[PDB]
Amino acid sequence: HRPVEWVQAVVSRFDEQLPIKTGQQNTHTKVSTEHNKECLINISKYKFSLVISGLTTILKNVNNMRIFGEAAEKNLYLSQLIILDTLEKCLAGQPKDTMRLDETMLVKQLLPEICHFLHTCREGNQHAAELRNSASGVLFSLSCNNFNAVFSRISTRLQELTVCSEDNVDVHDIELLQYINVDCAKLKRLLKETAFKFKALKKVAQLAVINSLEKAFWNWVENYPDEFTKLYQIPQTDMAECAEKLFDLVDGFAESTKRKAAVWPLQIILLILCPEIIQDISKDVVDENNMNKKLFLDSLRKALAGHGGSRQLTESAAIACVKLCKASTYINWEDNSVIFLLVQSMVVDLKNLLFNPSKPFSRGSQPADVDLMIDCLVSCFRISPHNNQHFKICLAQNSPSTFHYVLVNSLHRIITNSALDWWPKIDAVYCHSVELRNMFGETLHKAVQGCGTDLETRSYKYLLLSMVKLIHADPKLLLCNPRKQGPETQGSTAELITGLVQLVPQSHMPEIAQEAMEALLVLHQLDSIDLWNPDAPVETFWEISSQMLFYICKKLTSHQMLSSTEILKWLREILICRNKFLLKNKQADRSSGTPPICRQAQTKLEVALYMFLWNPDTEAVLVAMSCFRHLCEEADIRCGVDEVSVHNLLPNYNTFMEFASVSNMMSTGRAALQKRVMALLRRIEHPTAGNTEAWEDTHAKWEQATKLILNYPTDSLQEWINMTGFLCALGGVCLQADTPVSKFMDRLLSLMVCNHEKVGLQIRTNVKDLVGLELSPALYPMLFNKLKNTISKFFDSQGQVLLTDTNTQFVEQTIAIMKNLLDNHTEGSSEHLGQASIETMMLNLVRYVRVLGNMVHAIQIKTKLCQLVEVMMARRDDLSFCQEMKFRNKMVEYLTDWVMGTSNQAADDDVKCLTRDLDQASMEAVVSLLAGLPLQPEEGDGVELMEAKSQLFLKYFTLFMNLLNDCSEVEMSRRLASLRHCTVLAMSNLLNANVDSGLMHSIGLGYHKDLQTRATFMEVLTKILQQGTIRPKDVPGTLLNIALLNLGSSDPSLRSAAYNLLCALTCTFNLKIEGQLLETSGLCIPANNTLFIVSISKTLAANEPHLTLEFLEECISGFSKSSIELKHLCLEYMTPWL
Amino acid sequence: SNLVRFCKHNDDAKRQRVTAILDKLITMTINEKQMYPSIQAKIWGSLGQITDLLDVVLDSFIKTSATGGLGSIKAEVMADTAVALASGNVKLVSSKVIGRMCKIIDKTCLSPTPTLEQHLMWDDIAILARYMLMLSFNNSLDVAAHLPYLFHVVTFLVATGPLSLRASTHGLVINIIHSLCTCSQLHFSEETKQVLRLSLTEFSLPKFYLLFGISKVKSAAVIAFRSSYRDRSFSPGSYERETFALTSLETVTEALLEIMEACMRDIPTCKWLDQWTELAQRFAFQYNPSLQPRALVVFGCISKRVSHGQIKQIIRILSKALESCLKGPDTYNSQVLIEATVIALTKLQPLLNKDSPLHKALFWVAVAVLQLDEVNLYSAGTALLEQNLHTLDSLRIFNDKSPEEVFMAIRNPLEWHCKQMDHFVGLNFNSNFNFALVGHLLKGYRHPSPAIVARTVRILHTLLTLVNKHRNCDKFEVNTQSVAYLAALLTVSEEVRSRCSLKHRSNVLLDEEVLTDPKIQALLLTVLATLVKYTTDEFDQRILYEYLAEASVVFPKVFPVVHNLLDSKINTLLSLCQDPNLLNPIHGIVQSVVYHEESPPQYQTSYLQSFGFNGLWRFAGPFSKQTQIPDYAELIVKFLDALIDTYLPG
C-alpha cells in the first residue's frame, strides 16, 4: 500500500529537476538530484512496468511543450537527453526476464515518442546529432525482446504503400530497420516479407528498403560473429534461396547507370550469402541460374579497373569492393572458400585506386574520401599482416599528409576495436616504431611554428591531435627500440617527453593542450614507467620526470594564463603518480637518488604552491592547499623516522598538515577564505628557500602592480588586496638598514595617507584594515620604530607642532592601526610587544591632537585617542616601559584639561553634544591611568617633596569635586548617572595609592550632600583600614563620628555601609564595646536606629576616654552640616562624653 | 511612667481611658516628624521598660496599623516604633509578636481558600511580617529560643506576595543567621562558626535571589525599605506575579536544615528539630489547600523517622487528590497536592523498615504516576523511581532475582485491577516486562527540561546493569531480556553503539541467532521506528536509519509492521532532503521493501494489538499542551485503594 506511494515520490522528484522545469537550485551540487536517479534505476528491476510507464509520460509531456529563446532551446535539449539516457539504462539493467508481454506500453505509449527523434530533426545541427545517437541506442535495446511489436509496425507501412498508387514520401517508418537488433532467423523474415511486396512499391520506397536492408546486414555480422561463420561452415539452402529471389528482383529494378550505382553495394552482400553460386560462376555458367550473376560480377571489375568511361560507377565499385573485403575478414579461412580467392582478384586493383600518391581519389567535395581509405587499409592488414607493402607507402615522408592521417587513425582502430581473437594484433607493428617517432617530430615542429598555406597549416594541427591520442591509447608503440642516451646527444624517450610538455601551456591550441596532459599522465603509470629505458628504470625516470616539473612550474609562476587553474589539477596527479613509484622502488631496493636537479626542481614546486594561495580563483586556492599533503607524504617515504628527517628535510612539516584540514570545508566567498589562509600563512616559523623566494618573487609583482593602479589618471584592485594580505602575514620569514622587508613597510606607510581622487579611499580603508588585523607578530618592533620616526618630524625645532592637513590624516590613521593591533589577543604576539618602546610615540601623539583645536571634526579625534589610552592600560604587563610611572603622570596631566563640563550649553549648539561624550570618555581614561599610580611632581622648581605632593593631590581632588557638583540631577539621566559614577571611582583610585598625602584633604567627603556618594567613601575607607592589618592610625576619633552619624541616616544602603566601617574600627583599634560585630553585606538595617547608636556611644565614652578631645571636636563640626532631624540625634549620643 | 496601676484597675472602665491616651501618643509620633529621634528615646524607649504594661501597648499598635492597610503610613510607622519598645524587653516582645503570627496562620484552616493572598486574614499576616523584619536586626527576635518558630514561618512565606514582601523575607533570613554568629548566650565552637559564615555568603548569591523570587533585583535592602515612608503610602503595581515550584522549596528547606544541625552539635540536648517537626506534622495531615502542599514537602525533608501508619495517610491524600481533579473543573488547585505527595515519598522511603512490603509496592505508584501525562507529574515520578532502585540495592534485594521477578511477584494479589489499566494504556506487563517498562521511559526524551532527559538515561543504565547481572553477561551482551534497554540507549551512549555495531558498516545488534522469536523482533522494530517519528536531529536520524535499513534485510517478514510509523516522515524526506549522509539509508529502505514484496503480507500492521502493545508508539508522543487527566484515572484510584487494603490492613 505505502511502498507504491513511496515510489511515486522517487518518480515525481525526477520531473521537478529537469532544466526546462524550474531548476529551483535543488541540485545541491547535483549530488542530491543524481542520487535520486540511481534509486529510480535500481527500483526498475522489480517494478519495471511501473517505472517505465512513468518515464514515458514524462517524455510525452516534454515533447508537447513550446518555448522560445536561446535559453529555452538549450534547456529542452538537455532535458530530453537525460530522460533518454536514463530510460536506456533501465532496459539494459533489467535482467533477461525476456517477458514479451509488454505489448501495451510499446505499441502506443513508447514507440511513437522514440520514433519522433529518428526523423531528420533539422532543428539543431549539433543537437539532433546526439538525440538520434542516444535515441537509437534505446530502440536497439528495446528491440531485443519485443521484436514482433516493432516488426509489425513495418509490415503495416509496406501494405499501405503496396495497395495505394499515389506515391508518398513518409517512408520514415520503413527506415527503422537500421537499428532493430537482428538475428539469423529474424533476418530471414525481413528478406521474405520484403521480397513479396518489393515489386509493387514506389520508386522512393524501393531505395529506402534497399539502404536500410543493407545496413541490417552489418548489425547481424557484428553482433553475432559466430553465426556468420557457420553459414559457410555448413550449407543452408533456406538462407540461399531467399537471397537469390531478392537478388533477381533488385537487378530487375536497376537499369540505368544511376540506378546500378545505388544498388551495387547491396547486391554483393546477397551474392556473398549464397556461397556455391560463386564457385559455379568461376566454372562454367548455367543457362539462367548463374547467368545474371556472372554478368554482374564481371561488370563490376571493368569499372574497378577504370576501363569504363564512367566516373559514377568507378566510385560505386570502390564502395562495393571494400565491403566485400571487410566481410571476408570474419570468415575463419579454414574453409578457404572462394571468398578468399575472389577478394585476391580485386585487392591489387583496389589499392592502386585508393593508395596512388600521384592521383588522389576524390569521391566528392572532400579532397579524398578519408573514411573509405581507413576501411580498406585496416581490412587488408588483417588479411595479410606479416609484411604489408602499403604501410610503407603511407609511412613514407614523401607521401601527402592525408596518407599520414589515414595511417594513424588506421592504427587507432586496431588497438580499440578487435573483437575476434584469431585476428592479428598491434604487436606486429612495433617494428615500425622508429619511423613513427620521426613523423611525430616533424609534424610537431611545423604545427607549433604556424601558430607562433591556409589549409596546409590547418592540416598539420589535425594530424598532430591524432598522433597525441595514439600515445594515449598505447605508449609502447612509440617507445620500442629506444636509442639510449648518446654521449653528446639526448636519447629518444627524452626527446618524446620534451615535445609533449611544450604543448601544455600553449593556449593557442586548447584542444591539443588538454590531450597532451592526458598523454603525459599515462606515461607515468607504474606499468609504463619501465618502457622509458629498460636498462635502468629507476635512474632515467627522475632525470626526466623531475626535469619536466622544473619546466612547467617555472611557467606557472611567471605570469597568469587562462588555463592556469587546469594545469594545476593535472599537476596534482603527477605528484600522486610519482610517489607510488618512489614507494615501490624504495621497498624493493633503497640503495632513490637525489641529484641536484631533484633539489633544484623541488624548490620551484614550493615557490609556485605558495604563490597560488593569493590567487583570486577560489578553486585554484583550494586545490593548491591540498597539494601540500603530496609534498608531505613524500617526506615519510624518503625517511620513515619522524624526528631525524621529517622535521629536518621539510622543516615546516607540522603546519603543512593544517592546510589539508581547512581545504576540507564548505566553500565560502573569497573574503572568508582569505581569513583562514592568512592565519596559517602566519605560522611559518622556519626560514626556507621556498618561503624566502615566494616572498620576494611576489613582492616584485606587487610593487609594479601598485604603480599601474595609482599612476593611471574592480577585479584589478581585488588582486592588489590579495597580494598585500599574503605579503604581510608571511613577512616574518624574510626578516633579516636597506632590505626588501624594510622597503615594504615604508611603501606601506606611504599609502595610509594616499590622496588619490579616483580610488584613493578604498586603498586607505584596506591598508588600515590589514596592517592592523593581519600583520605578522614578528614585525611589530619594526612597525613601531618607523611609525615613531614618521611622527617625530611632525614637531619642528623647539617642540612646536606644524599642523598640516595630511599630517592630521596620518595621526587619525595611526590611532586606528594601533587600537586594532593592541585590542586583539593572538598567539605569539605578546613575546614581541616587549621588544619595542611605545612610550615616546604615545606622548607625542597627544600633543598634536592637543593643539588641533575645537570643532565637530577635531573632537571625534580627541574621543578616539582617549579610548586608545584605555586599551593601552589593559596590556601594560605585556608592553615594555623604560619609565612607567614618570610616563603615567604626564598623561594624567595632559588628559585632565579635556574634561570640561557644561560647555555644550554655552556653545548653544546641540551639534556639540559630543563634548559630553569626550568628558565621559576622558574620565574612563583617567580611571585606568590612576589605578595604582603614586604621585610624582616634576622638579622644575625647588620645593620640599612632601609638600610638593600634597599640593599636587589637592590639584586633582578639587577638579573631580567640581565636576561632581555639576552632575547632581537637580542642577540625560543616564549620562549623568554614568559620569557621576565614574567621577567617584576615579577619586577612589587617587586616594588609595596616596593615603599619606591625601587623607587630610579627603575627610570632607564624609558629610557630602549626595547620599549615594557618602556610601562609597566609607567603603573605600573600610578597605584602607584592613589592608594595613595625617596617618590613618592617628584619627580613630575622627572616623568614629562618621560611622555613628551615618547609622541614623535615611538611605537603606548607607546604614549598611556605615555598619561595616564601624566593625573595621573595633578590630583595627581594639575598641571595647558591649556586644559583637561581624562584617557583612546584604543586611536590612532598620530606619529607627536610635537607641542602638546611643548604646554604643555610651559604652565607648565610659571606657575609652582618650578619644574624647578629637571625638568632640568632630561631633560639633558635624552638627552644623547635618539637617534638623539629624541634629536631634547628635545631641543624644554626644552627652555621654561630657 | 505611672500607668502601671491603671492598666489593671479592676476593669473599672478606667482601663478604657489609658488606651485612649496611648492612641493619642501614637498620633504625635506620626505627625511630629522632626522630633522623631527624640520621641523614641523618651516616650517609647522608657514606656517600653514597664513589663506589666507591655501587653496592652502592643495591642494598640496592631489595631492602629490594621485600619491603614499593608502599605499605609500609619502601619508603616508602627513597624518602626516597635524597635524602640522591644529594646527594653527583647525576650517578651519577640515571644509575643511571633506568638500572634503562629496563631493567624493556624486559623486559615477554618475557611480554606485557594491561596493565602485571597484569604480574609491576609492583611493581618502581611503587617505582622513587617514587624518581624525590623525586630530581626541586632538579635531583637530572640533566636536562641525561637529559631524553630522562625524557620517554620519562613517556609510558609518564601516567594509569596508583592515584590516588596518577597525582598523582606530574604532580608529576614539574612538577619537570623547574622544574629547566630554574634550571640553570646550560645557558645559555638570555632568549627561551627565557620559553617555559618559560609551560609551567610551563599544566601547572597544570584542563585538564591532566584529561589526566593526576586531575580532582576540588584539589592534586596533597597526594595525592602522605602525612603518616603512617612509622607505617602506605598503604591504597589505590576500585579503580574511569578510562580513557585515545590522543588525550589526543597533547596531552601535543606539549606536551613543544614544550618540548624550545625548548631545542635554544640548546644547539648537541643530540642529545635523536634519542635519544628511537630509544627510541620500538624499542617501536613490537615486539609488546607493553601498550606498542605508546602507542609508535605517540608515534613519529608526534615523528618528522621516514619512509620507505616504515617505512610498510609500520605498515600491516601494522593488517592483523594486524583478523585477531585476529574470531578470538578478546578484542576491546577489539586495538581499541586499530587506533585507534593510524590515528592514526600521520595524522601521517606530510605527511612522505612528494612523488611517492609511497601519497599517494593512503591514501584507501582511511581509507574502509575508517569501515566498521567503532565510535565510536572512525570518529572516527579522519575525521582521516586530512580531512588526506588537505589534503595532496593542497598537492601540487597536484586541479588538472586531479576527486576521482572521482584515487582511482578508483589503485584499478583491485586492483579485484577492492574489488568484493566494495561488494556487502556496500551502496554502489557504479563506479556513482556522489559518492553512495557521502556514504553514509560521513552517519553522522558520529550521533556522540556534538559535535566529530566539525563535522569531517564541513568534510569536505563541502572536497569541494564541489573538484568544482565542476573545472567552474568558482562553488562553489554544482547539477549531477549537485555535488548529493549539497548535500543533506547543506542542514540545517547557511545559505548552501546561501539560495542553493538551494525553488521554492514564486537557483536552486532539484530543477531538472528538469538532474536529468533517473531514477537521479540516485532517489538524491537517499533522501538526504533518510534524514536525517529518524533526525533528532530541530524546526528540521531543518521544513526537510527542505518539500523532500520539493515533491519529491512535481516527481518524481511516482520518489517511490514513498521510502515505507517515510517510512512509519513520518509515520504517527506524523499521529496526534499538534500543530504548524502541521511539520504543513503532511506533509499536502502525503499529498495528492500519492493524486493521483498510479491508475497501476501504474513504479518499485518495490527499484529501488535493481538498481544497487548497497541499503544507503544502513542505513549511516547510529546507532552500535551492541553493539560488534562487522560480520564482513565478512574482506575488509578481503585488500584491505589486496593494497594492500601492489601498491604496496610490496619
Author numbering:
A (entry chain N): 4 to 455, 482 to 620, 674 to 795, 831 to 853, 887 to 1121, 1134 to 1191, 1845 to 1953
B (entry chain F): 1954 to 2458, 2601 to 2745
Q: Could you give the paper's own sentences about this structure?
A:
Our high-resolution single particle cryo-electron microscopy (EM) structures reveal the domain organization and structural details of the full-length Nf1-23a isoform 2 dimer.
Three major dimer interfaces between the protomers exist in both states. The N-terminal HEAT helices contact the terminal C-HEAT helices at the other protomer, each contact burying about 950 Å2 of surface area. The resulting dimer is connected in the centre, forming a core that buries almost 3,000 Å2 of surface area. The Nf1 HEAT/ARM dimer framework is rigid in its core, providing a stable platform for the GRD-Sec14-PH domain rearrangement while retaining high mobility at the peripheral tips of the two lobes. The disordered, S-rich region branching out from C-HEAT helix α103 and returning into the core at C-HEAT helix α104 could not be traced.
